[PDB]
Scaffold this motif. Sequence first.
Motif, short mmCIF file in Angstrom:
data_model
loop_
_atom_site.label_atom_id
_atom_site.label_comp_id
_atom_site.label_asym_id
_atom_site.label_seq_id
_atom_site.Cartn_x
_atom_site.Cartn_y
_atom_site.Cartn_z
N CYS A 118 64.73 110.10 94.31
CA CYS A 118 64.99 110.86 93.09
C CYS A 118 65.82 110.04 92.12
O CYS A 118 65.51 109.96 90.92
CB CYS A 118 65.68 112.18 93.43
N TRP A 119 66.87 109.44 92.67
CA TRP A 119 67.79 108.60 91.90
C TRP A 119 67.03 107.45 91.25
O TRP A 119 67.22 107.16 90.05
CB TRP A 119 68.97 108.07 92.74
N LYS A 120 66.19 106.82 92.05
CA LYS A 120 65.36 105.69 91.62
C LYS A 120 64.48 106.11 90.44
O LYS A 120 64.38 105.39 89.44
CB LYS A 120 64.49 105.12 92.75
N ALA A 121 63.86 107.27 90.60
CA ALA A 121 62.97 107.85 89.60
C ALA A 121 63.75 108.32 88.39
O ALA A 121 63.25 108.25 87.31
CB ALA A 121 62.20 109.01 90.19
N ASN A 122 64.99 108.77 88.58
CA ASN A 122 65.68 109.63 87.63
C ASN A 122 64.97 110.98 87.59
O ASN A 122 64.41 111.41 86.58
CB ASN A 122 65.85 109.02 86.22
N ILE A 123 64.97 111.60 88.76
CA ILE A 123 64.76 113.02 88.93
C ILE A 123 66.10 113.56 89.41
O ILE A 123 66.75 112.92 90.23
CB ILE A 123 63.68 113.29 89.98
N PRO A 124 66.52 114.73 88.90
CA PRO A 124 67.69 115.35 89.52
C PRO A 124 67.33 115.89 90.90
O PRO A 124 66.37 116.65 91.04
CB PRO A 124 68.03 116.49 88.56
N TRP A 125 68.09 115.47 91.91
CA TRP A 125 67.88 115.90 93.28
C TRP A 125 68.70 117.17 93.53
O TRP A 125 69.85 117.12 93.97
CB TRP A 125 68.28 114.78 94.24
N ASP A 126 68.09 118.30 93.19
CA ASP A 126 68.66 119.62 93.40
C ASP A 126 67.80 120.37 94.41
O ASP A 126 66.63 120.65 94.14
CB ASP A 126 68.72 120.41 92.09
N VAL A 127 68.39 120.67 95.57
CA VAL A 127 67.75 121.47 96.60
C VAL A 127 68.64 122.69 96.81
O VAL A 127 69.86 122.55 96.94
CB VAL A 127 67.61 120.68 97.91
N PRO A 128 68.04 123.91 96.85
CA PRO A 128 68.88 125.11 96.89
C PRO A 128 69.60 125.34 98.22
O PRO A 128 70.78 125.73 98.21
CB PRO A 128 67.87 126.24 96.61
N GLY A 129 68.91 125.11 99.33
CA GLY A 129 69.49 125.31 100.66
C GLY A 129 70.60 124.34 101.04
O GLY A 129 71.44 124.66 101.88
N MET A 130 70.58 123.15 100.44
CA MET A 130 71.61 122.14 100.67
C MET A 130 72.99 122.71 100.37
O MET A 130 73.26 123.10 99.22
CB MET A 130 71.38 120.89 99.79
#
Length: 54
Positions: A41-53
Amino acid sequence: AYYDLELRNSVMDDILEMMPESIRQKKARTILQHLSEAWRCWKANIPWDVPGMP
RNA sequence: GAAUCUCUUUGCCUUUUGGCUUAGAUCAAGUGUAGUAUCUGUUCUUGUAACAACUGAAAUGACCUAGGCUC
């Protein structure tokens, strides 16, 4: 590769330190996967947001 | 009241995954480049008679202690 492995190990250790678990081996894999995803995600520049985390 | 069995729900469950790298690279190319290795058929391959000699082989099994005769 070695560096990556080391990082992974460190992360796993940290997670272990964090909270109680029963049959943690299985969960370790999951954690690793999550980490990998985050990295991607970081590499892509996607925000890595997971709800269960937590 | 106690023993047990059957079903349903919750908890517990692989309500799904054991790495990293340029999402690993590419969905394209008269390729280039380096190496490693040997083959076709056509042929050679005397009779008859007399005298001298033998009448018969091989198999395994019946006797005796590999050998010796008989069937």
